[PDB]
Amino acid sequence: GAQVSTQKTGAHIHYTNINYYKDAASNSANRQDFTQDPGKFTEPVKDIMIKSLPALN
Amino acid sequence: GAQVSTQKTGAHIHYTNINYYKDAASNSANRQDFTQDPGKFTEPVKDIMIKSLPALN
Amino acid sequence: GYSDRARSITLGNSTITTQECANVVVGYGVWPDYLKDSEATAEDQPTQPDVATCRFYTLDSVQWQKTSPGWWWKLPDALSNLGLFGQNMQYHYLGRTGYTVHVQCNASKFHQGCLLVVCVPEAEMGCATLDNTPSSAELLGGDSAKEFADKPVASGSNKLVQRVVYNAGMGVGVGNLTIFPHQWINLRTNNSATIVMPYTNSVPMDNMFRHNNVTLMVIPFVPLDYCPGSTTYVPITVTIAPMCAEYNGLRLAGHQ
Amino acid sequence: GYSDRARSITLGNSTITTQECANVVVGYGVWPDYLKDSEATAEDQPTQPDVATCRFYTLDSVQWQKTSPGWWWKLPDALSNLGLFGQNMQYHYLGRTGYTVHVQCNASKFHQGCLLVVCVPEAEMGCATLDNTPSSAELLGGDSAKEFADKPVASGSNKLVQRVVYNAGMGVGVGNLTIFPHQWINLRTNNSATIVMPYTNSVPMDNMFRHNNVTLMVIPFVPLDYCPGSTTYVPITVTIAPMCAEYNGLRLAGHQ
Amino acid sequence: RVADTVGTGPTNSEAIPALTAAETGHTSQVVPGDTMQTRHVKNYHSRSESTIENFLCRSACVYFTEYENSGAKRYAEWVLTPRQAAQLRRKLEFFTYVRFDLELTFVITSTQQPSTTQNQDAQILTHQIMYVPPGGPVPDKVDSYVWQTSTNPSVFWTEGNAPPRMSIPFLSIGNAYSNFYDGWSEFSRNGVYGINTLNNMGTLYARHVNAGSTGPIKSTIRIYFKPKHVKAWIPRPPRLCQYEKAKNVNFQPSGVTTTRQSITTMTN
Amino acid sequence: RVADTVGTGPTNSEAIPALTAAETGHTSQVVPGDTMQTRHVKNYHSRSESTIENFLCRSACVYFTEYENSGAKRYAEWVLTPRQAAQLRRKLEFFTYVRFDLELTFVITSTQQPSTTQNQDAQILTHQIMYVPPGGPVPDKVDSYVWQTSTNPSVFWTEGNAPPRMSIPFLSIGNAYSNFYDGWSEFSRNGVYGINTLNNMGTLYARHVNAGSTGPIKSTIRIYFKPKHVKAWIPRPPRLCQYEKAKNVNFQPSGVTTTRQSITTMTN
Amino acid sequence: CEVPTRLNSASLKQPYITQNYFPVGTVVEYECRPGYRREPSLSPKLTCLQNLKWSTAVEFCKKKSCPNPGEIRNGQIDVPGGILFGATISFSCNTGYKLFGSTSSFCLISGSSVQWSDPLPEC
Amino acid sequence: KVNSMEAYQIPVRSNEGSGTQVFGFPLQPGYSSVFSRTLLGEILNYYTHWSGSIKLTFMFCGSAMATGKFLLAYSPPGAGAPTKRVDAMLGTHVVWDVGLQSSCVLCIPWISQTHYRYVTSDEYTAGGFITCWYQTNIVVPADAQSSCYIMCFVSACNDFSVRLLKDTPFISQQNFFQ
Numbered sequence A, B: 001g002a003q004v005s006t007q008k009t010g011a012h013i014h015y016t017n018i019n020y021y022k023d024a025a026s027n028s029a030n031r032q033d034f035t036q037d038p039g040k041f042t043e044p045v046k047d048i049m050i051k052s053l054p055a056l057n
Numbered sequence C, D: 001g002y003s004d005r006a007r008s009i010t011l012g013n014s015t016i017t018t019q020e021c022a023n024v025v026v027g028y029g030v031w032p033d034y035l036k037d038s039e040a041t042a043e044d045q046p047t048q049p050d051v052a053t054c055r056f057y058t059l060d061s062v063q064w065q066k067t068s069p070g071w072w073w074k075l076p077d078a079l080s081n082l083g084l085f086g087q088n089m090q091y092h093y094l095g096r097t098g099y100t101v102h103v104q105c106n107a108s109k110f111h112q113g114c115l116l117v118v119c120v121p122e123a124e125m126g127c128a129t130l131d132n133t134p135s136s137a138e139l140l141g142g143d144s145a146k147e148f149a150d151k152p153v154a155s156g157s158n159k160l161v162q163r164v165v166y167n168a169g170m171g172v173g174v175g176n177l178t179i180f181p182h183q184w185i186n187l188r189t190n191n192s193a194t195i196v197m198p199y200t201n202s203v204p205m206d207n208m209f210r211h212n213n214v215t216l217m218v219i220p221f222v223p224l225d226y227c228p229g230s231t232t233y234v235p236i237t238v239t240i241a242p243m244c245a246e247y248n249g250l251r252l253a254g255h256q
Numbered sequence E, F: 001r002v003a004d005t006v007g008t009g010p011t012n013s014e015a016i017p018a019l020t021a022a023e024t025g026h027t028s029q030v031v032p033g034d035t036m037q038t039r040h041v042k043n044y045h046s047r048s049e050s051t052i053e054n055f056l057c058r059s060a061c062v063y064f065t066e067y068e069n070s071g072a073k074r075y076a077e078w079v080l081t082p083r084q085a086a087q088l089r090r091k092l093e094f095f096t097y098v099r100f101d102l103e104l105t106f107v108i109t110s111t112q113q114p115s116t117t118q119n120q121d122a123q124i125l126t127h128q129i130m131y132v133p134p135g136g137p138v139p140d141k142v143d144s145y146v147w148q149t150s151t152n153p154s155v156f157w158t159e160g161n162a163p164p165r166m167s168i169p170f171l172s173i174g175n176a177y178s179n180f181y182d183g184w185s186e187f188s189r190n191g192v193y194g195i196n197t198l199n200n201m202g203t204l205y206a207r208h209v210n211a212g213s214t215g216p217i218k219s220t221i222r223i224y225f226k227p228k229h230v231k232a233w234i235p236r237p238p239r240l241c242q243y244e245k246a247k248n249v250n251f252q253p254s255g256v257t258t259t260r261q262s263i264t265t266m267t268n
Numbered sequence G: 001c002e003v004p005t006r007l008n009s010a011s012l013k014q015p016y017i018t019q020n021y022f023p024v025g026t027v028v029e030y031e032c033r034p035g036y037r038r039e040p041s042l043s044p045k046l047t048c049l050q051n052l053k054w055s056t057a058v059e060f061c062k063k064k065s066c067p068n069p070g071e072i073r074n075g076q077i078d079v080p081g082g083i084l085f086g087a088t089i090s091f092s093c094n095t096g097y098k099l100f101g102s103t104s105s106f107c108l109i110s111g112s113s114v115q116w117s118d119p120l121p122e123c
Numbered sequence H: 001k002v003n004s005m006e007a008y009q010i011p012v013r014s015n016e017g018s019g020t021q022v023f024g025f026p027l028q029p030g031y032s033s034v035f036s037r038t039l040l041g042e043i044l045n046y047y048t049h050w051s052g053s054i055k056l057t058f059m060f061c062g063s064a065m066a067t068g069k070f071l072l073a074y075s076p077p078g079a080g081a082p083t084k085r086v087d088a089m090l091g092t093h094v095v096w097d098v099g100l101q102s103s104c105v106l107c108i109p110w111i112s113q114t115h116y117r118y119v120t121s122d123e124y125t126a127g128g129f130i131t132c133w134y135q136t137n138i139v140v141p142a143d144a145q146s147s148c149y150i151m152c153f154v155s156a157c158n159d160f161s162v163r164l165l166k167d168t169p170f171i172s173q174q175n176f177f178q
């Protein structure tokens, strides 16, 4: 049950991984979770504020 | 002859295992046998005792 | 055809009309709701007063002078003695409540200033003396506001709270406080601030008396100013409304 | 296969096991429910605590002696200072609640006696003096029982309550009280009495402080008796459980 | 996974889940919902760290002994038993009969004993550990002929590496190991009384294969047991007293628990 | 991958992307193309070294302590905390609640203490590190009975190999670790105030299994933490002051920033 | 047998401390040291075994408890380490009230029991 | 009483009063002296954390002519232990009527703020208080003993669980047992 994944390469290749322990708290740290969502902290207003429009109307 | 099994994960992932020795008294201890049966020690009465009913009738 | 400057909020038997206000801020994008049956831990049936506890409570006002550093309120301990919210909080062991904060300050077109209203979760506060932690009679006073300071509090043998406005009492830059749900009151634009906060914790429920989930701080960044002849008494009023409050663990009254 | 002598009742976080009891009496054939939207009058949204107010409350015991006339409790005023039931009753103006009364008295096979437990609605009580009505400090005492008398109370210039057991304090035969929901405790048969009472009134809701919907009276018809050598202290305990309680009219605390 | 709670409401029935009879020697199967009103809770808690195998599967030091490279004490000998120490013994005597494979580890550490000898220069010490089953020719000396280990299992370990470790099978003539024995070894009801009747697991020996240096060195060997694949039957109450002898269950009488100020005191 | 720029031209419209209202507490989502003319640029730059896991997943020394093979100090004891050092503490207090597995590494180094003893000849030192959760029997001496480690996890390490390392699970009764706590431990609002209320992670002990030599040797153990699988919530502003005590957030007041010659000076 | 085991709560009785010879089968007895009450469940006796070792010894005495520090007026008392023999409680006053007296109060042994030697300050 | 069988007997009797207290102890299944030595407490002392509901079964061991009534109450922390029956009434109680059935079951539920509680003494993971009070009185006939005993049995419910393994603080050793 090997996992083949993609390495970190430059822009402008695969690696293989096997788990040997039965705990799941002992596996290698996940270095590939590129996910962003700034809506929670930036732009937290209840009413949507379109950019081109006047903020106060 | 590799065995793929599930790791220990939290609620709310697989590992691989091969045996190298020919004795079966030399393999890793089994940490995943979650089976319970308290009927032998608790509630050992010959006659079934329904909960809502009076114990002595 | 309306204007987004006026706004009304209805809760229980109370209603608050702003007339001139900025857009409402909603926590971390989350609206306060009840506890789910897949995230619960306590097995007894909770109580939900709904209308008695979830209404607008208006604390006692303070005065915005020209040299006011700022004020702070520990949110669970401010409403401890107010109405049926305080009563249920005493008898029950565990509670869980969201808030709505509505800060009001009005002035004329000739008055100038700027306040920052920030809801800070887990606002642990340092002490003037390094050896000992600050006392409760110092950290939180219900039915009144706690004021910051403009000069560093003298160290020694005491249990005071460091109150420097710039350090915010937490050893952080006051300017960097805009990480938490924050709203700005500009006397030339605004007259009120409204922040809705959900329940934040590492646990599904908690004892309100021994733990403060969030602390509301109002700080005058730009000072108050006016020309001689105009109104010199300008107060600041704070209204808090518990939302989706529920309690578990009915027992004897008191937190002893 | 069971016996109809044992019985358990669960309400809120309280449970009462009788073990040896007669069949439960249910008011006038009606089970207590909430107020319907076709019979309501007050327009604001009611509050329903549900678990905090609807639980078994155990008053302080009394002693059944050989010459005890009897005791009475005004039901709304007995639970006035108990738990969250009393707290909500103070803040709110209107309330509406059903009851469950569980009276307990046990004794050995060698003790004899007979008590009558009667829930009397609108039990207006007369006065020793014809000119004036009885005072509140005389009609109702919470946290304790009020006792009847075996001899007529002396008339004069006072505000006492006529307490003759035979006249029941209402100018009626005590034997004819079996018109209201009643249960009999016979020491050779019973050890407890259970009566469920709905909400009775000429109005959809009412102020609990200024009006008592029902009065619970326990009267020893056949006296207590035993032979020398057996237990001489035999108490009587009363447990009340508010059912489907709801309140309208949240305002300042107190009945002033 | 533990059972999830079921939501319940009020009740005015004849069902009496609370009242029971303890005389029948039956434990009540009552849940909190029988005696109060509850909500629905989904429990993800698991009883995975409560399995008997997981509880007993951890290495524990059962004994340690010392030998030298000079003088009279040149080798060490131990009759194998799991009752020398307190911790694993008490963990194992929760049950009457157990059955497990074993994992054996040794931790050997040398130490230069003080001496007036000069120009000391030691070489790498090598140790030999040997297992002699009952009936074997026990070594009478360090340079004996039995250290050839023709059939007796033996391990050779050079200092400065991962500690030695081997796996042991059940190795019992009985269908299960007994932690308790109520009886004697002779049919005439005299002799050895107790669990010492069934302990015939052999003997262990340890020595230095070389002297290493011209200065005395004392080596200490520690033995670590780990039960694997455990099957247990007939649970028993835990030891209230403190163990005295490994061979016998003899004990000094002790109170049932600790005392407190009063029957209504919430402080120990 | 960062968003690519969009080419823009001149504008004479009523759209006002620049003018906004900061009072609403809303950050503007303006790009450079709103306020000037731009060209089309394709950006291949990635925000891969900015993930919270990558930022916190690096070993850091949290503590170091020393023990000897002679005298009074024969073993070392540390109550586990991540607040003893400055660097990882400040990195971790960017957030209010965190949740991670742990990777633990130890670096142990011995050093011959000066002595008048002669004919010194040491053997390989072996160390034992033991973890005692709250409620365990803490060792009162070096040759105690608790170093048997029946259930307490322990490691044995011989000098001259790769450093020891094990993996730790979340091990928290709370749903997330708290870096800040606003409250007391007693319901009467007195006692321990602050994050010390929730620190009950246990204790760590270290010793020499042998003495090795007839001359005193002092061993130093350094402990390295590495957070793996990290989940963080509620970001907080970075510490402006300098940490004083690990137990309390007490601080000495400091200026908001550094000063410069004038408001129109481009040199610090 | 060698000299009996030393304990942190109990000490040998008068005949045993003087004795230097312990044959097999000898019983020695301990007694609570000052500031330590005796646990009724445990018996303070040690026998000499055949291997010339004493039997397992467990602490036969527990620390004594100083009385409740009480409630000071217009101030608070930290009580950091509890109220057992050898504790140390601290006193303080609110903003505007000056402490007069001692600042701390150690739990020490005064006579046959444990008492707090320092008195309560007034503020 | 610990060097006897008297540690197990709860001594109720007939008194000229109503509302007094029988016993009382805190909910610490593995640390309190009352619970640290039962089977449940002995299993707990090998684990750092615990979670779930508790069963407490009380059996009346008086005469068949004696009759009684009791209040068994659990009160979660936040206020001190109740000192009067009325204060205890406000918690989670059960009224036990001593009839043909000789046993009643008070089930202490899980009302923690966390998911798990520490076995060792910890103010943050407080458990609560368990108390008993005379609901009425123990009424006996003549020529029948008025002093009786109750017995208490402790069990865990089907949602009980334990976590980190540790060494027991009870067993100890100074030399190798030979």
Ligand SMILES: CCCCCCCCCCCCCCCC(=O)O
Pocket (backbone or CB within 6 Å): E080, E082, E098, E102, E104, E129, E130, E131, E153, E154, E155, E166, E168, E171, E177, E178, E179, E201
């Ligand atoms: C160098 C190789 C050495 C091999 C030594 C093997 C020793 C086997 C010991 C078996 C121990 C069995 C313990 C049983 C305990 C019980 O009776 O419950």
Ligand SMILES: CCCCCCCCCCCCCCCC(=O)O
Pocket (backbone or CB within 6 Å): F080, F082, F098, F102, F104, F129, F130, F131, F153, F154, F155, F166, F168, F171, F177, F178, F179, F201
């Ligand atoms: C030889 C084996 C030793 C094992 C030692 C295990 C120690 C576990 C320590 C866990 C530290 C958890 C830190 C949490 C920090 C926080 O509260 O944010």
